[PDB]
Design a protein. Sequence first.
Lengths: 497, 497
Amino acid sequence: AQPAHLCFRSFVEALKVDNDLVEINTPIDPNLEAAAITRRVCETNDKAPLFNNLIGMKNGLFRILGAPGSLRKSSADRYGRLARHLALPPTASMREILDKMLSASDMPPIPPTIVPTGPCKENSLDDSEFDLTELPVPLIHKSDGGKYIQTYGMHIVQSPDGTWTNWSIARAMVHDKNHLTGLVIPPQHIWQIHQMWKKEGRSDVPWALAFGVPPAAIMASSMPIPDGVTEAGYVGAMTGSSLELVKCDTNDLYVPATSEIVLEGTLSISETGPEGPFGEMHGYIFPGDTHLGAKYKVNRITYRNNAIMPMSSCGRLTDETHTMIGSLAAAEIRKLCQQNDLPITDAFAPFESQVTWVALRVDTEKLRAMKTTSEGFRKRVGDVVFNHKAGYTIHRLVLVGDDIDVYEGKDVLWAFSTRCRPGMDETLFEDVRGFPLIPYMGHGNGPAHRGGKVVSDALMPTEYTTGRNWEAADFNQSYPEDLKQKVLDNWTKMGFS
Amino acid sequence: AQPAHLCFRSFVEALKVDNDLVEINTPIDPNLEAAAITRRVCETNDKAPLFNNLIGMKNGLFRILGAPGSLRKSSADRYGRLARHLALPPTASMREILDKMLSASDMPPIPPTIVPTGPCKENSLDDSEFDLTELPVPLIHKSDGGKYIQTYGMHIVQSPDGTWTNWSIARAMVHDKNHLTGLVIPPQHIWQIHQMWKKEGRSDVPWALAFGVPPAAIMASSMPIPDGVTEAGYVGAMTGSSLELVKCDTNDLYVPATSEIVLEGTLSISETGPEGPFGEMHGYIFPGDTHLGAKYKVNRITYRNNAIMPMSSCGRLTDETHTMIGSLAAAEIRKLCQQNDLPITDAFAPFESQVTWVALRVDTEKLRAMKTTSEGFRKRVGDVVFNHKAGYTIHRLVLVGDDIDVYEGKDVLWAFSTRCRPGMDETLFEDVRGFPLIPYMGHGNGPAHRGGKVVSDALMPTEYTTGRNWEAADFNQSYPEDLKQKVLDNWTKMGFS
Ligand SMILES: Cc1cc2c3c(c1C)C(C)(C)C[C@@H](C(=O)Cc1ccccc1)N3c1c([nH]c(=O)[nH]c1=O)N2C[C@H](O)[C@H](O)[C@H](O)COP(=O)(O)O
Ligand SMILES: Cc1cc2c3c(c1C)C(C)(C)C[C@@H](C(=O)Cc1ccccc1)N3c1c([nH]c(=O)[nH]c1=O)N2C[C@H](O)[C@H](O)[C@H](O)COP(=O)(O)O
Ligand SMILES: [K+]
Ligand SMILES: [K+]
Ligand SMILES: [K+]
Ligand SMILES: [K+]
Ligand SMILES: [Mn+2]
Ligand SMILES: [Mn+2]
């Protein structure tokens, strides 16, 4: 066999073939050691670790793959892990990756295909046979409030009426032998669907959590595609293939046939339990900061022979919470802007901003034809984005003109720092949903859930009127073409590197 | 040999010895080519170029050294050029460099020593014998409004009463055979002294411009040491040695004995001429943006045999306008804060901010004892800094706690992005002097000369009260010491780089 983008086991193979995998066959402790190695990998853009000999692995549960969506060292294949989720060449640009993830947005869905069995059915454990506290679930950060089994699996929940099945990543930790607790927060789709079941009031939410799903599916799971859109059919259109799914044993949900590990059960409409703290995407943990979270009951586990659990050891740069959350949100924001008739060509969440900013590249020819001003345009952009779920995680939008490559953080920083006058060239948004996970929100001086957002206009005045009126004081723009070429051609002759 | 910090010719030797120099002995055009090579050096942190065969060099005037204060590639000796200005080991940290530049602030001055002659007297040209338009003055950027002879020399002017002699860098370009035009703007000391002569009204300002001065002198020339303080005596205290100076031939000013090239003349109290545009430190040139500047008359040139003119090809990162202007301003700001009883331990202007920000590291134990709040503390800090000349070039101050290394831009960006809530955690300053060279000031939407400043508080709430209440979600802080060491010790064994 199955292609890498359609089968996690094949994806692991692909990373090996790529010389992008280190297989660790000696015993590794899931209590911190696996996550520490993965953390170091993510901080240094090293090869992904596959822990084949995890202390506590029994009867096939489980090996761990760390850093599944993290960066490679080389510039040429920096995003190659992400490309391997999507059948793209390993040298694919971020633009190419994001365009692939947006491609299904004006295609008919390709609904999934139901097949009678698959590798995820190779082994099973009923509710007399498993204990979640006895599995080699990792402690990811030393101060975490639980062992976070769920950092890179896919929650599956369906609206009561059956018309929308959502796939998404949301964290969860082990509560006891047969329960998890996790985040289920607005405006996320798992929360939206949970609210539908709670208003109906009759039962707990049928649920499954599938780990080691098709890589193309985990990417859509991490993207804020629209309300009401079933991720499986979006992935089918993106990949050009209907995804093969098998029915759960204990409920009527459907999971990818090649899932490594599947939990089946219910998400309670009534019960909560302690959740967190967790070392999070912005780079912090607040020890002792436990709060009630949603509570999941597990009734059944099914799994592949020699099952592999993917794990995100998230925190400071760079891991899946940056490469996927930020970039995929930025992609959806780009599309949302264009659908609102805003002249945005590109969007990216700079890593340097801890993926709390999105830089929006403006087609300034189109802007000029709008015959508008900074104040008006900033407000329009911020209203569109900050009032929408796709903008949830993003607290600063930086508008830049056509000369800036938004996928290059040094260039975004240059433009922000030199073209946006603090205060005057910004519009603050206090009456929008805020992202409480940012430390200055949930642990800050103001409301955790509201405000703290800004549109920073790094468009220069003449970009709204007559056109750019500067040249950069750089090698590229400050010297004629023939001179530049001469200098390059004589560079090593003269004595330079 | 004479020591490198005391003699520019010896400094050039030192860069060669260091394998930090490329001697270009074939013909190089001062019309763009020399500056293009230097620009490329600065953008890539390559070796400094010494142009020994400059097209248009005659009778000893002149060779060019580019990139005298720019960065080296290696992290270990990144600031080695700057260290070579100061007699410091080439591996000196930025903290060490800035401490050396601040050291003379609580020492008695060591006034200069007058000697009868020096190398700067080896050759001379009277006012019948030179023509500035006939010298190989560089065109530094293709759209510059003149040939900028003066990018790394030292202007010397003295108060009418004789009590203060200032040394400073300010740009100047050739106007005609015997005149320059340049920037002389408030609140700079050359401007302050010029205003004293203008109020006296009796004559033009006696002036000299010395190129290829002692490196320790050019560093102080680039630093905003206090009003009324004679740089020569500050440099003498910093270096532990009295600087040797020779009298000008045509006026009673005194220049370093080993200056490569000296212009003697007057800075007019009445005349102006076209100046600019110039490709500037923030990374831009605005073609055609010429304005009246100060006008200098040159009466005499003296120079060393085989004179070398230093040149800054300034613009986008990284050159002297970043490494020296930003860092030296930040050093003075650190001291100014401490003298105002503010608990600041360190300051640096991040390169990523185009040296428009300064990050201020706070001793949070001291902060806690102040029993203050963010609003109050931000306002106090901003009032101190933004009302002072040392703050002139800086538009954003970022307050950070003790965990942040302000000399590491990635860590400043992380703290700013995650700990400062836009709007609420900031105080805007509109009634302070602004720096018009920033594009969003002089080419922006508001007053060029006023406002546009902000204090951004990236201190978290408990840093004012009870202490830091988080751990970073990073390898260093999220795992115990013994585990970290194990992972490091087994890193290459396991298969990692
Ligand atoms: C790639 C990744 C993604 C998330 C998360 C992590 C990783 C690796 C982990 C599990 C490592 C961290 C965790 C987070 O702590 C970060 C976070 C992000 C956004 C909201 C809350 C938490 N998390 C997560 C997340 N969404 C969350 O609702 N709680 C979560 O727990 N997300 C983001 C989420 O998938 C996206 O917002 C999707 O758009 C959601 O799908 P839809 O609702 O649009 O269908
Ligand atoms: C290292 C360097 C420094 C400057 C400049 C350049 C370089 C390489 C060049 C010449 C390349 C660029 C030019 C600039 O265009 C940048 C600039 C900076 C600050 C004000 C105006 C211009 N410039 C300069 C500068 N000061 C200026 O008053 N006009 C100047 O022309 N400075 C800064 C100035 O030296 C410092 O502010 C000192 O504190 C001044 O001394 P005191 O007044 O405190 O005694
Ligand atoms: K999703
Ligand atoms: K602007
Ligand atoms: K000075
Ligand atoms: K703050
Ligand atoms: Mn969804
Ligand atoms: Mn001075």
